[PDB]
């Protein structure tokens, strides 16, 4: 698989004294990062969602007060012309 080919690539590039052992170590680090990448993606997406939801609630909270003050002004000014 790609693991074997890239491990041989590393064993030729870095040129270790013990090729097989360093190869295995690199294999293990790679198979850990294979999950770490998806975990990073999950973290980023979830944090962005949290941010957006906080901002959505901050917006609705002000929309409510806008409407309430507007209704107050509505009634107050309507009384003037009756």
């Amino acid at each position: 698989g790609e693991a074997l080919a890239r491990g041989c690539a590393a064993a030729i590039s870095a040129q270790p004294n013990d090729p097989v052992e360093y190869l295995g170590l690199w294999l293990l680090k790679y198979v850990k990062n294979a999950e770490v990448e998806g975990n990073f993606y999950r973290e980023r997406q979830q944090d962005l969602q949290k941010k957006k939801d906080r901002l959505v609630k901050e917006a609705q909270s002000e929309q409510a007060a806008k409407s309430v003050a507007l209704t107050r002004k509505e009634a107050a000014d309507a009384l003037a012309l009756v």
Partner: protein
């Protein structure tokens, strides 16, 4: 002044794994294999790349300075008597007049004169 930049970029990092040159090499080597047909963000791809004898001075002078504080350690002969002036009051007077060495050094000087005047092997009558 181009080999200067290329040399600077390869300054290996003890904290991180490798140099900045190698970081960019790995980033580009991934992108050339990644081939984002639509687009890609630099920050996120660089983050995905990254996520995949002590040298201390000698404390002799400082410890000698700190040893004048408190009382020495015992594994005691009587300290000899000596006369002197009010040295903390001297630091205060000098500080009020705007001369001298301050008032932290006044404390250090008073404790040093104490360590001198109270010495058996040096039978002192008075210190100033």
């Amino acid at each position: 002044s181009v080999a200067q930049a290329l040399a600077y970029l390869q300054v290996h990092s003890p904290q991180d794994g490798t140099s900045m040159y190698d970081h960019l090499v790995k980033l580009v080597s991934k992108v050339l294999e990644d081939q984002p047909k639509n687009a890609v963000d630099l920050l996120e791809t660089s983050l995905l790349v990254k996520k995949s004898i002590p040298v201390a001075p000698d404390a002799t002078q400082t410890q000698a300075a700190v040893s004048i504080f408190g009382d020495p350690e015992l594994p005691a002969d009587p300290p000899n008597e000596f006369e002197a002036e009010n040295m903390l009051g001297a630091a205060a007077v000098l500080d009020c007049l705007g001369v001298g060495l301050g008032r932290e050094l006044g404390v250090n000087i008073a404790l040093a004169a104490k360590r001198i005047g109270e010495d058996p092997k040096l039978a002192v009558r008075s210190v100033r």
